[PDB]
Amino acid sequence: ADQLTEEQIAEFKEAFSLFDKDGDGTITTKELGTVMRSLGQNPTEAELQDMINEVDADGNGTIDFPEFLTMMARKMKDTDSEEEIREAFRVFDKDGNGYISAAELRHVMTNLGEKLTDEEVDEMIREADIDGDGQVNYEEFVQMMTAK
């Protein structure tokens, strides 16, 4: 579950360096909390440390690029099981509609700082909404989540 393609790795190089403010090759909670700060979120030291330590396999206490590759590849596809897919569904449809609603996804985006327009989220939902209910159910989202 650590597979990335070369172009994929190249993008992660970029992303990694965007968070790695010191440009040293390891991301600290300082850097995370700062990118979060500019994003409009102030998580705790504990949240960020745990977040790191989860991917921190070498035990140095920071997120190295190999570990990031591991982390992302699991988030983008599988940790092992369908956890990642349902956790993503869970963060989109909190209200339990059984389907992800665009209006709610727009709301979570505002909360995530991604800041997407209604038309943007509408299009995202529309493609994921396979049966055409205007809302995407889990079975529809499972195909979409891995389509990155």
């Binding site: 992303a15 965007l18 998580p43 949240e47 977040m51 988030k75 993503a88 963060v91 299009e123 979409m144």
Partner: peptide
């Protein structure tokens, strides 16, 4: 990491990666 080539694919990638946790690092 922009979204211009296909836009949807990149955004659906990036914004959804970020959604994975409250203090989610997509990096």
């Amino acid at each position: 990491s922009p979204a211009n080539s296909f836009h949807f694919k990149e955004a659906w990638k990036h914004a959804i990666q970020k959604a994975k946790h409250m203090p989610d690092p997509w990096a």
